[PDB]
Write a protein that binds this ligand. Structure first.
Ligand SMILES: *[C@H]1O[C@H](CO)[C@@H](O)[C@H](O)[C@H]1NC(C)=O
Ligand SMILES: *[C@H]1O[C@H](CO)[C@@H](O)[C@H](O)[C@H]1NC(C)=O
Ligand SMILES: OC[C@H]1O[C@H](O)[C@H](O)[C@@H](O)[C@@H]1O
Ligand SMILES: OC[C@H]1O[C@H](O)[C@H](O)[C@@H](O)[C@@H]1O
Ligand SMILES: [Ca+2]
Ligand SMILES: [Ca+2]
Ligand SMILES: [Mn+2]
Ligand SMILES: [Mn+2]
Lengths: 181, 47, 181, 47
């Protein structure tokens, strides 16, 4: 049975198993993608290419990731544009940014964007964001307009552990964010 | 303890190449914030 | 940092997660490091860097690897030179071939080029191998002259399970080889 | 069920960089032979 896993409890400046792109860097502990500063883009990828399905047998992989992540906006009322976990072709590099979260370009279904993301979305884009305008978790596939959506209240500066996993049999994604309170 | 959870089928084989990369991607624009990640696990299986 | 593992039951024509060098290419199911053909080297390296020890804390990992390899020689008499699992700095290239198995260049402790290897040696090099000239397996560290060996009866064309582990709490490295019998 | 076995003290920390690569090499000179690897697992815990 082909399997692959890792786990990183702490980060550090020199980290040969990650590929920083845009403003991405590791401090002495945090892996920080953007400082409180405008019009940027942070991207980290796990160095190692991952096999998720195979075309000899056709099967898809069960998988789970887990990360604790803190968003900290020096304004309470003023925060954007988002954070995102995403799976992507092997050789992907950044895309159109700010509210596109450096990961998508168009707003209509783009097939050639071979890439799926899970977003935590701290800013309303009336162009495509849920009309109600609430901050949201969402499952994106090939456009920044999410296939699904979920209102969520950001707690600023709050450690928020999250699990995301995918059933190969039922073929369902799902996400869970949690706060201590 | 408050918690959110979303769910959805998404036919990965249909959509992504045989081999991927994962990572995070986080952006500011006009308005902004610190977006940092404290730790990371990931497992996968393939029958 | 804590936990890296994988497992690979078959090797597939393209392996985005493996860095080949030399004649190393992956056939339909196997990984061929060498063809029955004079004067080559082949090396294949897990793509992911791997944090064996941490200055931050001082702890060394312990790890366990496992493979099956086969050595299939046209004439059970004139075979050479060997095979070898190795742990080397993060961007090694083929070292001297033949007797040095593309991992070393010297009979001498060369602190500099900083690699250790478990060697399944199949050719007597009068110059450094144990002298009774029997094939052998060896733990090599900064030398092609193993700090230690067992004599070892080769079985051409037949599969060997090998298990290697390092216990980090006593720095003992142990190799085991097995044939169906 | 012929078996071979061998262990030894190797100060890894004093021999090898904080970050390494694992791998196989096989080699031929005057005499040769095929060297193939069939399957490969690896697991490391750094606690
Ligand atoms: C995937 O995992 C469970 C584990 O038993 C199984 O019952 C079912 O087939 C799948 N369920 C999900 C998460 O859709
Ligand atoms: C090294 O550590 C254990 C823990 O007791 C020791 O007894 C044994 O020699 C080795 N086993 C491990 C952790 O692999
Ligand atoms: O951060 C709020 C907005 O910032 C910039 O205006 C970006 O153009 C936009 O994509 C984003 O939504
Ligand atoms: O292959 C047999 C032998 O051939 C040559 O003598 C090479 O110098 C040596 O490296 C090898 O052991
Ligand atoms: Ca948005
Ligand atoms: Ca030899
Ligand atoms: Mn959105
Ligand atoms: Mn030898």
């Amino acid at each position: 049975d082909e399997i692959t896993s890792f786990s990183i409890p702490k980060f550090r400046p020199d980290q040969p198993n990650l590929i920083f792109q845009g403003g991405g860097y590791t401090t002495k502990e945090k892996l920080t993608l953007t400082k409180a500063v405008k019009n940027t883009v942070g991207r980290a990828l796990y160095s190692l290419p991952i096999h998720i399905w195979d075309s000899e047998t056709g099967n898809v992989a069960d998988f789970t990731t887990t990360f604790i992540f803190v968003i900290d906006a020096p304004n309470g009322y003023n925060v954007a544009d988002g954070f995102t976990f995403f799976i992507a072709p092997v050789d992907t590099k950044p895309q159109t940014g700010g509210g596109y979260l450096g990961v998508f370009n168009g707003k209509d279904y783009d097939k050639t964007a071979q890439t799926v993301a899970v977003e935590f979305d701290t800013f309303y884009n009336a162009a495509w964001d849920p009309s109600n305008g609430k901050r949201h978790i969402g499952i994106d596939v090939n456009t920044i307009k999410s296939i699904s959506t979920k209102s969520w209240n950001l707690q600023n500066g709050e450690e928020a552990h999250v699990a995301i996993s995918f059933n190969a049999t039922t073929n369902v994604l799902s996400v869970t964010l949690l706060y201590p309170n | 303890l408050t918690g959110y959870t979303l769910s959805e089928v998404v036919p990965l084989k249909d959509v992504v190449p045989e081999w991927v990369r994962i990572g995070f991607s986080a952006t500011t624009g006009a308005e902004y914030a610190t977006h940092e990640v404290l730790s990371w696990t990931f497992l996968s299986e393939l029958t």
